[PDB]
Amino acid sequence: STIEEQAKTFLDKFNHEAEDLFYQSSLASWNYNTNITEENVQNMNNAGDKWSAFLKEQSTLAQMYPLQEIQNLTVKLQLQALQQNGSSVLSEDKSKRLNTILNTMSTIYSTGKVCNPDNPQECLLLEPGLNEIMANSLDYNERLWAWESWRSEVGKQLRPLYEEYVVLKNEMARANHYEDYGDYWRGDYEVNGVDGYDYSRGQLIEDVEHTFEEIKPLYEHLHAYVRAKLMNAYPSYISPIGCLPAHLLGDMWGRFWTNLYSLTVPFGQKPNIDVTDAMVDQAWDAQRIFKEAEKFFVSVGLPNMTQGFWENSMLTDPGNVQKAVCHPTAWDLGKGDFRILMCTKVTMDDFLTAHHEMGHIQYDMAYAAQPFLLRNGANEGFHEAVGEIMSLSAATPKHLKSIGLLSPDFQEDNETEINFLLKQALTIVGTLPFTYMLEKWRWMVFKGEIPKDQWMKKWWEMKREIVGVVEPVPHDETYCDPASLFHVSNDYSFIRYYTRTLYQFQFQEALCQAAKHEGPLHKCDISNSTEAGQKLFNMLRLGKSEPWTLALENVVGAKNMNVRPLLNYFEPLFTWLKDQNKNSFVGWSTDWSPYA
Amino acid sequence: TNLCPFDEVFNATRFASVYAWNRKRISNCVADYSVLYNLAPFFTFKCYGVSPTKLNDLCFTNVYADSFVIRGDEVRQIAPGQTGNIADYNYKLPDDFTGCVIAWNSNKLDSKVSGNYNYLYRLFRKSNLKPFERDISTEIYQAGNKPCNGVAGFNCYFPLRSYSFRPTYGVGHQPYRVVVLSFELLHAPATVCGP
Ligand SMILES: *[C@@H]1O[C@H](CO)[C@@H](O)[C@H](O)[C@H]1NC(C)=O
Ligand SMILES: *[C@@H]1O[C@H](CO)[C@@H](O)[C@H](O)[C@H]1NC(C)=O
Ligand SMILES: *[C@@H]1O[C@H](CO)[C@@H](O)[C@H](O)[C@H]1NC(C)=O
Ligand SMILES: *[C@@H]1O[C@H](CO)[C@@H](O)[C@H](O)[C@H]1NC(C)=O
Ligand SMILES: [Zn+2]
């Protein structure tokens, strides 16, 4: 018979067997998460190992189907997903060495501690000592010491491990018909076989560079504003023309500028929008929060949560005997089993993250009719973008007035809008240069453009060129500062955080084009609008069955990632910054250093 | 004044598998559907051919008491002119089907933690099903171009799969018990009228 007919039945069997095994593994992991016992750990390890062994055996079996004689797009996608060799192509000794290297790197990252001399006992881990010191202390010397000590007591144990990891991953990628590991990671956005909706693996770099170039001026103005505020904070440590030292950007690595908000408030006489008091006063619990979230999602036409979600999910910290992780997460075990794990507290932040996780659950519920191999977002940026759009819709003052939570006498003025847009930009704008820079450095290190003996020398060059961040203490080649970050030392892609930040702003305005919104884009709400809900559901229900270009076009009317809606969103703050920067200088000089 | 044995079928401890669905032939008694017509202890009742609104005055030759248990979302497939997994590999109803179907949830009974591998259903078949046909074969399904030699291997599968019913499924995956009462009438005195 035809090869596609010989593969259809194989796919059916794989689906019917993988559903049960994935359900077993997910159930075991959930039981571990909600109840930490030794038997739970053993059960979860056994289930995970069984699922992984079955997956590997099925992939080995599937590798025998010639893809060159199959034309159906869905079957081609499923078999291409199932036919990956992975790291098995590498030799057994090399594979064992790679696994040992990865485990050692993760253990060093998550186990090392830092302490000053003459205190060999009281040594702080990364949390909650280093993070709190970075995000709360205003002492220059203490911050510098913490930064340099964390980067000097860890990178030494990472540099040779990282070099061997780079070599092994590069040879593994080359053995699997790829140019290098960077190409292997870029292959997630690759689209082929569809006429008029194709995407090249090398086009991602070009698109990212174009988007960053057209973004640049807003980041320059924001950096000038932040630099002026920091200079006013530190009278004799920051030059009026220099870049920003790396040990003064809120957290350890300067990924987010959120913690800078307390030092960059435009109008400090008007308090922020904190509605914790109204949350506490009206006798409001976690169940009420989730019912409000469900009502908000119902108001746009999306279905409501089932009884199993209410019965099985854990929406409150158990306390007493049970010990559970409090990181919120939307679990999709499969077969109609959806749950949300979170330690709810009476706070507006929990109110927003409830909407985030419920959007995750709704998107998981949307594509439950797809085959097992296509039950995920179109690419690695769609899913969190759909998560964040719900929070953006629900954070507006109009929605908070639509739930009877704020006094109707509260009238929004331009000062509060400026404060809100600056707070949003200190998280959205302040991370795109960092993400792009780190991904570019890793890509070109894998490609081989940077020789080893020059790695650090290139890494801190872009900090002066792109991010505009300077080094407080000179660094030698033996350091491995970039490896100190979480994602790089755990073999994680780091470009998904870029495209997502754009994709959401493309979706938002598109939905607001069906909500008939009049006015600025920073106050649009999709509530009580069935057209926007239907437009969103059209994209959500597709899952991975179609190229992500088609999914993007089905909502925004464009076949490529774009950033113009982001600038449209930030136009008011952009104009305010342009007016305020009449005396401050836009730009920075790379040759400036604090130590000269 | 013989009451037809409808009482002992609904509340049986266990029902057979989907591909071994149980049948009962009922004749020469009195069956009253008004007991379940206005009581509502079930969840779903629907049917074709005969209107439930007091049409037991007619006479039928025999009553078929088909019974089995399936997945929830497959309850839609027990209907005339339907196509799917059940309608192609497990049970196929005639296009002009006359009779009634009652489906109700059975999560408190047929659901066990860590799975309830006791219910079997066919997944692969070489053809379709003629109306009112039985399948009790255990032959290995051939999908490739080589003999299977009676063992599972390349392009050789076991045609039966087990429902892993566990009390934490969604409403779609939860077990549903289905009873099909078929009123077969032909050229006969048709003593089974049910006054
Ligand atoms: C958690 O696990 C322990 C031992 O595994 C058990 O005794 C306890 O009942 C479990 N808690 C719950 C809520 O099931
Ligand atoms: C692939 O096969 C499916 C059958 O499940 C069909 O619906 C679809 O149109 C086919 N597509 C192509 C491109 O052959
Ligand atoms: C890698 O995949 C190709 C086809 O994708 C296959 O021919 C080859 O055997 C695989 N490698 C190994 C070691 O099996
Ligand atoms: C969810 O919405 C449906 C509307 O089709 C409604 O019938 C159902 O009762 C709702 N769920 C709850 C728990 O109210
Ligand atoms: Zn998320």
Keywords:
heterodimer; A: about 600 residues; mainly alpha; two-stranded antiparallel sheet; about 5% strand; B: about 200 residues; mainly beta; five-stranded antiparallel sheet; two-stranded antiparallel ribbon; binds 2-acetamido-2-deoxy-beta-D-glucopyranose; binds zinc ion; Spike protein S1 (chain B); zinc (chain A)
Q: What structural class is derived from the secondary structure elements of chain B?
A: mainly beta
Number of helices of chain B: 4
The strand count of chain B comes to 9
Oligomer: heterodimer
Strand order of the largest sheet of chain B: 1-3-9-4-2
H-E order of chain B: HEHEEHEHEEEEE
Helix content of chain A: 40-55%
Main beta sheet of chain B: strand number and arrangement? 5 strands, antiparallel
**What ligands are attached or bound here?**
2-acetamido-2-deoxy-beta-D-glucopyranose, zinc ion
Radius of gyration of chain A: 25 Å
Proportion of residues in helical segments of chain B = under 10%
User: What is the approximate shape of chain A?
Assistant: globular
User: How many H/I helices of chain A?
Assistant: 22
Strand content of chain A: under 5%
What is the tally of beta strands of chain A?
4
PDB class: viral protein
Keywords: complex, viral protein
Assembly: dimeric
Entry title: Cryo-EM structure of human ACE2 complexed with SARS-CoV-2 Omicron RBD
